[PDB]
Structure formats: structure tokens, C-alpha cells
Design a protein around this ligand. Structure first.
Ligand code: HDD
Ligand code: HDD
Ligand SMILES: [Ca+2]
Ligand SMILES: [Ca+2]
Ligand SMILES: [Ca+2]
Ligand SMILES: [Ca+2]
Ligand SMILES: [Ca+2]
Ligand SMILES: [Ca+2]
Lengths: 678, 678, 357
């Protein structure tokens, strides 16, 4: 690890300058006790110069994000399908670093914005660093990389006033979506729960593009990368996400950091779909088109290995802020395809690191370094940290005996372009007609959602498009939505007081695909790390005893228990003042605390009605809620929460209460609490 | 015409060109065949993507989140009797300005409504050079020596292992620093008051913080404090409102300012000074060099120098607001520095830090930084040099350029000059003046000057933040410092966190008060123009829409911003219930034709369960004027648990009588009787 | 290493301090700032050549190019969450740097020059008086060279005004080259004082001749010339001189061709007398007259020169070099030749070969 060598311990010692001279840094040097500061105060200037220069440009996209270290372990020797060294043996372990992100927001924007999310993975392999720079949505908005600045200018804030932050809910974004119909598939995913995932751990990763697996014999197959969550799939609801953005902008980064610290590091199966080169145009679309998925019914997933994140960074800036991913970080055994989106990405990620790092030696930062020797004739540049011993860095040479030697298909385990690849035809700036169906797959996706998930997606579009001020953009939006689904256009039009266009059935169909629905993906496979708020009181000795019994029972099963009361003490984690329903996956009231839920309840220690609002918000957002103790009746009445409700619990016995409540936590959301269009 | 019209680029017509004027396209990559790989010879692709890849610059090291506008400063008099400053030398003399407002801790995407200190930075483009006053909305600063700035800022910014939490002092490190560095107490009390969560940039004041000098053409000097006094009045959010608003509208302050300017409600401030003699530096019971102290207005009254009005929004946010580079080193003849060790070190920081932001030394050439008078100097070259200098002899002294440019000084060329009565005497020391040692009296002065509900809000802010501090040593240390300002504050805060306050230490306790620091105490707002009224209506009753239309006409006559809310958009409805929130309004009105939407059984797929009532309830609980217009008020007020006889609760059949009452409620702004007191 | 080394007078250690020299004072600012230009970022002290050889303990963080992974997640002072580390270093603890505690300041805040700085001419005259006569001539001749290339007549006149304040004789001798009259003597700062240690010509023979360069001019024509050169090489290399044998073409024992050779390549030049024919009144292998020109240039520039082997008149007469000149050597004995020649290398320059005013 080039990180180990660069760790700096300041647990002991006297303060020094950056050149090791012991100094102080608390008072400026002045001409007299009430005098002006001296230019000769080098202690002042070195410290303030460093401060003045701490910042670097944020990433042009995915500025908001968080990372962790872990390991990838291969399940098999995959030599039969790829030459890739990190996949060449059962049990072979490769260190990883992953960064998760949103896309549009700046640094400091909220984790729980509605957005596409990044899932970028570095494998520090024994044949070089290999990055899979993916997203949580398997399809992209655009079909050619040259359009990326158009997409991103349109979804980022309007450039006269820089409003709005971290949101596509503005005219320019919906203008672009409605004028560039390729956007429909990713737009449908972003308007689904996939736009507001419950955590980084509860979302999948996708390479998006078709890539190639290349064997040592030169043969190739076409692949798609899928990183399948072992925590299950889960979403927030929009109203909840909006509050959580305010209450805790750091929710996803905190969730990941806490899961790793608690020994619950998240896991994914790293999978591929594998298909023959001859199938590029066999599935009714082009595998070069990054707006399309291969339905799992046409190509099943093969599990290649386990990705586990299990160690947080030491210094966020040095590791997470400075990690510089590139799809150009490729290894022998993998190749590109002629996807015009992927093709232009390769240029962008090498160039942009010059902006971020301010100079060309960014691969020398410890987080970017490889775990194998570097042998090349790259030299000099600002921030050069190496002292090269070869004073003949040119090829061909005799004065360094021909080293470094060329690597290729037959030498030094070189990367090689898949030798079956060809190109033929005119040099054109033309789109393939095979890319022209922008609407069938958006429909496939929409069909594959549950009825309440379809409603959530319609309601997300109703929310955003109602904030578009241009009547002509809103009309154009309905024109494009109508090509995917007349019913979606009609339901969205109803919220904005416009008429939908007449049905246009060209791309309408009834087909569905497995594995894209969140609500449909069944109970969560584990409830470890899920958050339980216990609403108690210091008023009643019994209320703190009830809380402490629930705590033992719930903590047994790996739940993160927060006991909330008016004030802190032994056994109480948080005050009502700091508590919010967005902080919990389920909420339990101990019946000992009933008096806090009365309409007349008031305290200077928390805002009017806070205890009941927590319970009501949790219920209205679909969470498991209940009252534990015996007068379960009374609290449920104040909340207008029906005792016979799905995901509403009411037990005198703590043992019975928890057994029922933990099933609700796995169900995770009670969708019968949301109204559907007729 | 904008003051920067010479630099404007119009793209309302024309064909796409490269940056060198070659007509091009930018929508499809050049490929070897229609399904081929992209070509390196595609310069169209690479120039567009290189530009995109390099769009970002480092955010400001502090004050990264902010927003700006153009306007005019107008002098009320000829101030040559106190200052040589040209921009102040005649009655009615006009100078263009640019102002940026900001928070301090958050990154450039963080919420406007975080609790924080705020920036108020003003550039005067004077006829004798650019003059900047780089101020805050709080008149005192945390620390007494610039060399400590990185300590303060590291402690309040996110913890550097995981970069949590964003835009908040509510974590261990910050309260560790506050409790170990007692100078922080005065600013801390201001930040924990409503001055930490201002209602808008227009509803806060600006302060230079430091003592400066005014210097006459005869060389005599006076000591001054700058105060920019809002002509809009002072107003705050409540914390539990600010937290939701951070999620519902991270852009609230920048939108409020932008909208005020577009509506012809450009905000205004009286630019004022306190003026005292050089002999009064240590006359008021503290040192005028100490930036943790105010001069109570009872000791030195404000003199109004002129009017600051902001009335023009930027054309390009990045080019004007993101790129504006303020400096206290931007000083003009007639002003001088003081030996305040905080101001002293700032002068270094703001010249250096622009190298980080701009990437090169020619940042004063950016349009927003250029002066409006000629530049004559021997500065040359550097990256990004825009000027073509004719003078081939840029050294002094010269004969080959006839001795030009000529030296400017007190006696020639209207030169800047150091106040000539200034001296220094004594040892060259890294020592703090004992005159700086009282860190507690003025925090007590401030606390004493707040109303009772205001004192409660400040206690509650401290209770909120300190309850989130994990360390029991840090919480005890915080109570030790707060106890030196006020035993009552320490006891009340300690009650929320389950510790005992230490015994009273009355060394610094006193009962003195000072005018002009209280928000609650500053009486009704002088204008209600721009304040926001939400009218909750329904499409289900044509008569509810008629009530809303009649209310709109009458409220808009008085310059209120009216939003009619209903289930769906149509003519006369601005916003759906789905996108509406009480944080969007300064007052809420329900038309009694919509009373059915407030029923417990009310449900719609078009908005979250209970949304209409929650808007009314939140508005009431946050202290806003609320009412029901039309005569049938019982169903709504009873559903909301709001008493018809409450102060700032309105029930009238007559639209005219409703609006007359409700408008007095908007001027009152907050009904503080709805908040519990210890 | 060399291009990236970033020196600073702000790189100071306990036991050294600054003075109020206004030139030094402003340097402290410049050298910290300028490394931002060179490095493009604030972490230039992390470059290997700039790193210290002792631990770094401070709360500097982040910046482009940050190489460290800091473990201390509480980088502020004062702190309890990192137990108050790093600790402040000062005069009394941790071997801190400290400003000399006797230093004071007193007076107005001024942009004024100390009148104690105003004598700009006495020390130039002290320096000039301390040079030997030939060295004064060299200095006059450097000023005559440079000032003759100044196009402005008024600049040239202003230069003579200032030079005249140091020395009227300098002004007169410079003026003679540029066709101007010197201004009348102004004796305010004239004096006859001298100081030791500033003269090069007067600093006596070099204390070592190791590394000094001896060019041996030979020929491939005459196998005996190559034999003479080989014998001379052996004798000179024994004493640590760097020997170059020059001939028309390369072969074993010949280092350079006459085409690439120049008198500026040598501190001393020896012709072996077997090569005397090359010193007469042409070849496609080198420019016309090259062998003789190397000898003549070496002589004109003051170097020790000579002929080894016993026959010197043909070479020295072709060169217009007198056999009895100081720093001109002729011996048949290689040992004798080298003993005499080495004394000449230590003398280094024979300054009797330069004309004086
Ligand atoms: C032509 C430009 C372009 C295009 C078409 C894309 N991107 Fe990209 N992307 C960039 C240009 C870029 C960039 C400007 O080069 C960034 C900013 C920071 C960086 O390292 O690269 C970036 C960053 C970035 C990151 C953040 C990595 C990190 O955490 O540091 C992720 C996850 C993605 N992108 C993912 C994608 C996916 C899955 C794409 C489509 C399949 C995609 N991008 C298309
Ligand atoms: C020694 C360093 C230091 C100290 C003691 C302070 N600041 Fe500062 N401040 C900076 C170093 C700095 C900076 C790093 O130089 C920034 C970042 C961006 C910039 O141009 O300057 C800055 C930015 C900055 C801005 C943003 C200007 C804009 O909108 O672009 C404001 C309003 C202030 N500061 C105000 C203050 C006030 C009122 C202070 C105390 C009275 C103060 N700062 C002390
Ligand atoms: Ca827009
Ligand atoms: Ca969902
Ligand atoms: Ca740079
Ligand atoms: Ca190849
Ligand atoms: Ca902390
Ligand atoms: Ca307040």
C-alpha cells in the first residue's frame, strides 16, 4: 500500500513547519504588544498560505460523494472467458476503493436529492489499476459523449442565478429531456425510487456500456457489468427525502461510514451478462446503445466475485476527494466497444484530472498509485515525486539496453485491442438508425414496476413538471411522455392543468422484465443496520424501563436503536429537539410516554408537537410504527393511526412486539398508505 | 446597460462556432463508420469536452456558498471634513457597487438556511480605485489574531476523516474549539441567536467588524466602525423552520434577493460609521484593536454616510458572482488600517488566495474585478495576461519613459498614504495584549440585550447543538465557558444534556444592555413589500378559486408576493399542494371554500396525506400570521388546534378587513407568544 | 532535483534570526509566494528535494497534490480531542524558533529611506582601489564594451555622471571609448583606501591545479607526435590534470578533433613538436588555420602555452609568441616541461599580455 508509507502521525510531538523546524502558530509577530504584524513572520505566512490554497476544483459532475476501502474476491478461475489477472483464480483477492455520489449537485449539496448516482470502483490489480466507473441506473440519458455538456448544463442550476441546486425540477432540464428523447429511459429510472435510494448500500452498480471480455487466445465476448446489492434494494419516499435533505445532508455518507465502523461493511455480487459478438443486434436493439438494457430473460447474470467495503478513509480529502477514476484504467482481458458515449468518456477522464490536480502527476497521489512497479518514459511535470534512474527515457534505445520493453499480446502481459475488431465505412458525424427507438424500453421499465411504484413515478413527474414555468416546455414534455405511455401523459397532465396528446401507440407494449422494481424485490434479506427510534420520556420511570427492554431485544438483532426523550441521561441517545422521523426506519412509542402525544403538550425543550409529528411522519412515509406496553390504544388515536393497519403494531409483550415489528422492518415500506389514481 | 456591458457575448442568433470563430456542429462525434469508434481528429468533440472538463474552479476557502448583485452607492454629504475618500466627497455622488452575501462554513452547494455567520462583502468601484468592505452580518469575530483562522475553520468545517457534518457547528470539534478558545464566546452567542438564521440577506445588517481609520487630506485620523443598517428591517427564521427550508429550498436566500431585484424591490442599507478619536482606543473599557468587541451605540452614535441599493442581477453567475475576488487590501486614499491582529493578517490572505481560485496572477483583469479608472503600473506578464503594454521601460526610476508612471503619495497624484500619526514602539513579540483578555463581559452584554423569547431561542440553539456533541469532556468544558458569561444560560443548557452546571462564577456577570442588537426587539418591519402569502384553495369549488382571486388582487396591490395553492395547476393557481410548504410563506390564508381539504379523512394521489393542514399547522407553530377568510373558520382552525382568539390568527368574512388585519400580522412578522419559556 | 529545488530565506532554524535590512525583509515574502507559480500548488515542500530529514508535525492540510495521509482528525489548536498535540514550540519549550528577544522597533510607520544608506559611491571606490592595475583595466574595458552598445546619448551621459562620483579616472577612460567627455571631477566620495580579499588577480597562485584542462595539439601524420602526446598525457594525468589530445581525426589516445576543439576548452595548451607542420600557413577535416588559432587564442587570453620536444621556433614564430615570454614554455624533457607548465597553470593567467591605458 503506497498509503501506509504516506500516513503521518501527529499523536505526539512539537509543532513544526513543513521543513521540520519547531515553531508556534497561535500569535502573530508584531512591532510591540499593540503593534502591526511583521512581513518577517514566516510562521504566519506558511500557515495562512496553506489554508488559502486548501481547496481544489470540485468534480465537474458527481461533486457530492463518499468513499471506502475494501476487497474484491474472485469466485473462480475465469480464464475461460477473460485474460483479466484479478479474475484468474478462485479466492484471488484484490484491494478496492469505491466512491458513491450524486451527479448534479455541488460539494455540500444533500445526499438525498433526486438524481442519478455514481458507483465508481477501483480494483488495484496485480496487472494495474482497473476502474469500473458506473452508476446506480443501468442506462444513460444520451447516446453520444459529445452531448454530455448539453445534458449537464441543462440539469445543473440556471447560469444567471445558479438556481436550483441538485435538482432537475426546472425549465432547462425538462426542455432538454423533451427535445432529446434518448433521455426517456434514464429519466423514468431517475423519477422512480432509484432516484432517491435509501442508502449507497441499498442500490446496485452498473457499468452501463457494453464492454468486451478478451481471452489470451484473442477471442472476445460482449459483457455488461452488474454489481448486485447483498443488502437488498430500497428507496426513500420523496416527501421524506426533501425533509432529510435539510435535517441531515450527510445521510448516505453517514450511513456508509457507520455500517463499516459497526462491522456491517456492505457487499455486492460482481456479475456480468455475457453474449456473443454475433448478438450485437439480436435482442431488438443495438448493444452499442447505452440507453438500452439487455433484459435478464435474454441473458442471465453470472456471479464473478464478492465486493466488500470494510474500511473507512483516514483523511477524506487525501483519499476520497483526490481519487481520480478513469475508464482508461483498463487491464489485459477487458476491451472497449464502439458505444459513442463510452468512446468520448475515455478522453474526458484523463483530461479533467489536470483541472482537479493542477498538474500532470495526479497518478502519483497515494490513492491513485498502483500496487505494482511502474516502468515508463513519462518525465518531469509539476509535482514530480519520483527520481528516475534511467537517463535514456526514449524508445528505441541502446543506452538503456532497450528497457523498458514493449508489452503486447505476445510480450510482458501487454494490453491488446480485441483482434477481431474492425471498422468499415465513411468517416461520418451520423447517428446509427439502430439507436432510434427512444421509447420502447422506458415503457418496458414502467410496465415492470408495481402499481404504487408507477404512482410514485407519476407523482415525481407531477412534482417536477408543475415547477416548469414554460407552458411550451410542459406541452413538449407531455408529447414525449405520451410516446412511452398514454396513461402516464394523462396522469401527469392532470396535475399541470393541460390536456395530454392523443394516444400514439407506435412504441406501446405490455412486456415486463425482472429485477428493475424496488417495491417488487420482496422483503430485505437483512435488517442489520436499520434504525429504530424509541420515543420515551424522563417523566415516567416505567417509560425508560420499557425503552431499555426494547433496546436489548432490538440491538440483539443488529438494529441501531435510538432512545429519544426530552433531555439526555443514562440510556437516552437524543433529545426530541434533534430527532426527526427521517432519522429512523421504524418508530416505537413506549405507552409510558402517552402524555407527550396530547394536542395540549408543550415544552421549552422541543418544538410544539415534535413527539407526535415524528410518529405521524413515520406512519405517513410508510414505515413500521407501533406502541409497546398495554395502553397501545391511546397513542394510535392521537396520531389518527389505525390499530388494524398493515405495519402498525400494538402489543403489551415486548417479545411479541419486536417479533412483529422486525418483520415490518424487512417489508421496509407499507405501500397501502399511498393513494392511487383511478 | 450593465456596468460590464463591454464584456457581454450575445448568442441570441448565429451558427455555432469554435472559440476561434470556425462554424462547427457539436451533436455527433466523428466515427470510422456509422457504428465505428470515435476519431482523435475530431477537434469539435475535444474542444467542447476539454472546456467542460475544466469548467470548475476551487470554491472559496470560506464563504463558498453565496450570491451577489450590482447596485449603486449614493453619498448623503461631502465627508471631506472626516475622510479624503473620493466616493464620499460630495452630496449625491454615485459609485457603482457589487455585493456578495454568503454563509461561512458550508461548501458551494450547501443550504442558505444553515445556522452560521454570514458574509456581506461590498465593492465600491470608485473614481480613485476599487474599495472593498469585506464584512459579516455579526459585528464581532470569533478570534483575536488572524494566525488562528485555520484553527477556527478546521474546527467548524466537517470532521476531516469522513467530511461530516456539512454547514454546521453541531459537532465535537467545533465545541472543543469554542470551549478551549474563550474569545469565541461573543460571536458564538450572536450565531446561536436569530442572527445565525436570518430571514433573508435583505433582513440582515453588514459590519466591517474591525476598527479602521478615516484619514483627512491634512493627515489627521479618526477611528471608525462600519455599519450597514438594513432599510428592510431585521428578521429571523426559527430553527425548526430553517431545518425544513434547508431541504425544501437550499436556494432560499439567493432566490429571495434575485426576486426582490426583479420586482423593483431592490434592497437598501444606510452605510453608517461610528467615529471616535484616536485617544479613545482604550476609553470604552476594552481595546478598539480587539475584533471581539462592539462599541455600544450608547457610547458612539451611528452617522449615516450614504445609501447602498442593490437593483441589478448578474448576467452570468460564474463570471460575476463566482469570480468576484474581494480584498481588504483594496483600500483608497482617505481610509487606513488599524493594528487589529485579525485585520492585519487578513491583508495577506485575500491577495494570496486569489492565486488558488484564478490559477494565475492576473485575476484583477476579470471583468467583475476591473476598476472603472485607468491602470498605470509596471506589473507585467503572468499567465492569462490580457493587456498589451506599450511602455517598453517598466521600471522606476527611468528616463526612457520620461519618469512615468509617477509616484503617488500624500503630496502628489492623490496617492494612498499611511495615516502619518501612526507609530510602533516596543519589543518584536508574539504576545497577546492583556487589554484583549475579557472574553465574557460583552457576550453577557449581548445576551442581556435580547428579549425573553430571544434568550430562550439562543438557549434552545445551544441545547440543540451541544446535545449532538459525543464527548462528555467537551460538553463539561462548554458549560465551564458558558457559565462565565451567564450561570442561568449554563443551567438551562445543562438541563437538556443531563449534566450539572458548574457553580456560579460572577467575575464577568453584569446587568448592562445595549440597543440595536435584538431582532425580536426591533419592532414591526418598516415594509411588508416582497413578503410571501400562501392562499390554500381547491379546484373542487369554483367559489374557493373566486375567494383566492379576490384575496390576490387586494394583497398584490400592497406589493405582497401571492401564491395560490390548489390540488392541480390552472389559470390563477401558482403551485400544487405537492410542491407547497409553510417554509415558502411569511403568512398563510385558507379560503373557507377549501375547508374540506383540512378533514382528517382528506386523501388524494395528487399530494401527500395531510399536506393542506400541515402547511397551516407548520405556519402557526413557526409563529407566522395565519387565518381563514370568508366567515366559516371553525372546521379549519379546529382541525389545526389553532384558537380563533390567538394573536396573529385572523378570521373575517370581509376580504378588505381580513387583509387589513393580516397585513399588520405580516409587519409583526412573528407571534412569539406561541413559544414555551423555561 | 535541480529544477524543482525551492530555496527560501524563510527556511530558518533556531539560533539564526533576520535583521531589518529592507532587501532581506521583502525577500521573506517573495520566496514563499513564488513556489506557488513554479509548483502550481501549495504542497511544494513535499517534493523529495524539498522534504526535511526530520518529522513534520503540523495542522497544514489538503491543497492540490497533497501526498500525506494525516491520522490526526482534529487539526486545530487549541484542542482536547488530540490531547493538545501538536504542542507549541518556543524559546522555552520544544526547541522552537524564536525572534531575537532584544529586537525592538520605534518610530512612525514610514515609507522613507534611512539617511544612513545614502553613500552610494565610497565602497565602489574602495572595491576599485583594491584591484590590481590590469584588473582595473579589465573593469574599465567591460564598462567600455557595454556602455558603447547603449544607443541613448543621454543615458551614456548619465552613466558617466554616476561613474565620475566613484572615480574621475574611470569616467575619463570609459568616456574615451564612447566619444563623450567625462564631467569634471567631483571629489566628495573619492579616497585611496583598499581592502584585502576582493581582488582575483591579486589572490595569488591557485592552491590546487587538479581538474585544470590541458589541451595537447598533435597530429596523426607523425607516429612520433602521438608518442609525445601519450608520454605527456601520462605525466600530466599523474597530477590530476584533465588531458585532451587533439588531432585531425580520432583514434586510440586522441580525445577530440581539431574541428570540435577550441582554446576555451583548455586552461593550458601544449603543442608536441612532431605536430609543428600543422602550425604553418588547410584540410576538409577542420577550418583553415584551426590548430594555430587554438594556440594563438590561448596565448592572447593569458593561458600557459608551450611546445614540448625541443623544437619550438617554428610553432612560436607562426604564433607570434616570444620564447622568453612569461607563461611560454619550451623543453625537450617531458618531466622538465610538465614541472614548468604546472607552475604556469597555478599562476593561471599571465596578465603582462594585456595593454593598459
Ligand atoms: C464526455 C464526458 C462524460 C460522459 C459522457 C460521462 N461522464 Fe462520467 N465523468 C466525466 C465525464 C463524462 C468527468 C468530467 O470526466 C468526471 C468528473 C470527475 C472525473 O474524474 O471525471 C466524471 C465523473 C463520473 C463519476 C464520479 C467518479 C468519482 O466518484 O470520482 C462517475 C461515477 C461517473 N462519471 C459515471 C458515468 C457513467 C456511468 C456514464 C455513462 C455511462 C458517464 N459518467 C458519462
Ligand atoms: C487570515 C485569514 C482570514 C481571516 C482572519 C478572515 N478571513 Fe475572510 N476570507 C479569507 C480569509 C480570512 C480568505 C481565505 O482569504 C477568503 C476566501 C475567499 C476570499 O476571497 O477570501 C475569505 C472570504 C471572506 C468573505 C467572502 C467574500 C466573498 O463573498 O467573496 C467574507 C464576507 C469574509 N471573508 C469576511 C471576513 C470577516 C468579516 C472577518 C473578520 C473580521 C474575516 N473574514 C476574517
Ligand atoms: Ca431553468
Ligand atoms: Ca419506491
Ligand atoms: Ca495551475
Ligand atoms: Ca493492440
Ligand atoms: Ca467533530
Ligand atoms: Ca429570533
Amino acid at each position: 500500500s503506497p498509503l501506509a508509507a504516506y500516513e503521518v502521525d501527529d499523536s505526539t510531538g512539537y509543532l513544526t513547519s513543513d521543513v521540520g523546524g519547531p515553531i508556534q502558530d497561535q500569535t502573530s509577530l508584531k512591532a510591540g504588544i499593540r503593534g502591526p504584524t511583521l512581513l518577517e513572520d514566516f510562521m504566519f505566512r506558511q500557515k495562512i498560505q496553506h489554508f488559502d490554497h486548501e481547496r481544489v476544483p470540485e468534480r465537474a459532475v458527481h461533486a457530492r460523494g463518499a468513499g471506502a476501502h475494501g476487497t474484491f474476491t474472485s469466485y473462480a478461475d475465469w480464464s475461460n472467458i477473460t485474460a483479466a489477472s484479478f479474475l484468474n483464480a478462485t479466492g484471488k483477492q484484490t484491494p478496492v476503493f469505491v466512491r458513491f455520489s450524486t451527479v448534479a449537485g455541488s460539494r455540500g449539496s444533500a445526499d438525498t436529492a433526486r438524481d442519478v448516482h455514481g458507483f465508481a470502483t477501483r480494483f488495484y490489480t496485480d496487472e494495474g489499476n482497473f476502474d469500473i466507473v458506473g452508476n446506480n441506473i443501468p442506462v444513460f440519458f444520451i447516446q453520444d459523449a459529445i452531448q454530455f455538456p448539453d445534458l449537464i448544463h441543462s440539469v445543473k442550476p440556471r447560469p444567471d442565478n445558479e438556481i436550483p441546486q441538485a435538482a432537475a425540477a426546472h425549465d432547462s432540464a425538462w426542455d432538454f429531456f423533451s427535445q432529446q428523447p434518448s433521455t426517456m429511459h434514464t429519466l423514468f429510472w431517475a423519477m422512480s425510487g432509484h432516484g432517491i435510494p435509501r442508502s449507497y448500500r441499498h442500490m446496485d452498480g452498473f457499468g452501463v456500456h457494453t464492454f468486451r471480455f478478451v481471452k489470451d487466445d484473442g477471442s472476445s465476448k460482449l459483457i455488461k457489468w452488474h454489481f448486485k446489492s447483498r443488502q437488498g434494494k430500497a428507496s426513500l419516499v420523496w416527501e421524506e427525502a426533501q425533509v432529510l435533505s435539510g435535517k441531515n445532508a450527510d445521510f448516505h455518507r453517514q450511513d456508509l461510514w457507520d455500517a463499516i465502523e459497526s462491522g456491517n461493511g456492505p457487499e455486492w455480487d460482481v456479475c456480468v451478462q455475457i453474449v456473443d459478438e454475433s448478438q450485437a443486434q439480436a435482442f431488438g436493439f443495438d448493444l452499442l446503445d447505452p440507453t438500452k438494457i439487455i433484459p435478464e430473460e435474454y441473458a442471465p447474470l453470472t456471479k464473478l466475485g464478492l465486493l466488500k467495503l470494510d474500511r473507512n478513509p483516514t483523511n477524506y480529502f487525501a483519499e476520497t476527494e483526490q481519487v481520480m477514476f478513469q475508464p482508461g484504467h483498463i487491464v489485459r482481458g477487458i476491451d472497449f466497444t464502439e458505444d459513442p458515449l463510452l468512446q468520448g468518456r475515455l478522453f474526458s477522464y484523463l483530461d479533467t484530472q489536470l483541472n482537479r490536480n493542477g498538474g500532470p502527476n495526479f497518478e502519483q497521489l497515494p490513492i491513485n498509485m498502483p500496487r505494482v512497479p511502474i516502468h515508463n518514459n513519462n518525465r518531469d511535470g509539476a509535482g514530480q515525486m519520483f527520481i528516475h534512474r534511467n537517463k535514456y527515457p526514449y524508445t528505441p534505445n541502446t543506452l538503456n539496453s532497450g528497457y523498458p520493453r514493449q508489452a503486447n499480446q505476445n510480450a510482458g502481459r501487454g494490453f491488446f485491442t480485441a483482434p477481431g475488431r474492425t471498422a468499415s465505412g465513411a468517416l461520418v458525424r451520423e447517428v446509427s438508425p439502430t439507436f432510434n427507438d427512444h421509447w420502447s424500453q422506458p415503457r418496458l421499465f414502467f410496465n415492470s414496476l408495481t402499481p404504487v411504484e408507477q404512482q410514485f413515478l407519476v407523482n415525481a413527474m407531477r412534482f417536477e413538471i408543475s415547477l416548469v414555468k414554460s407552458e411550451e416546455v410542459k406541452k413538449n414534455v407531455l408529447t414525449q411522455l405520451n410516446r412511452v405511455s398514454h396513461d402516464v401523459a394523462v396522469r401527469v397532465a392532470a396535475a399541470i392543468g393541460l390536456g395530454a396528446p392523443d394516444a400514439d401507440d407506435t412504441y406501446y407494449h405490455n412486456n415486463k422484465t425482472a429485477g428493475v422494481s424496488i417495491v417488487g424485490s420482496g422483503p430485505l434479506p437483512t435488517i442489520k443496520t436499520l434504525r429504530v427510534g424509541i420515543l420515551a420520556t424522563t417523566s415516567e420511570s416505567s417509560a425508560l424501563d420499557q425503552a431499555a427492554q426494547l433496546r436489548t431485544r432490538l440491538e440483539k438483532d443488529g438494529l441501531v436503536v435510538t432512545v429519544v426523550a426530552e433531555t439526555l441521561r443514562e440510556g437516552v441517545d437524543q433529545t426530541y429537539s434533534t430527532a426527526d422521523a427521517t432519522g429512523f426506519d421504524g418508530v416505537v412509542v413506549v405507552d409510558g410516554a402517552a402524555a407527550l402525544f396530547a394536542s395540549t403538550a408543550s415544552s421549552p425543550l422541543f418544538p410544539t408537537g415534535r413527539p407526535l409529528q415524528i410518529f405521524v411522519d413515520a406512519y405517513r412515509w410508510g414505515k413500521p410504527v407501533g406502541v409497546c406496553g398495554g395502553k397501545s390504544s391511546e397513542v394510535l388515536d392521537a396520531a389518527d393511526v389505525p390499530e388494524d393497519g398493515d405495519g402498525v403494531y400494538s402489543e403489551e409483550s415486548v417479545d411479541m412486539f419486536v417479533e412483529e415489528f422486525e418483520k415490518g422492518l424487512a417489508t421496509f415500506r407499507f405501500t397501502d398508505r399511498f393513494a392511487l389514481d383511478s
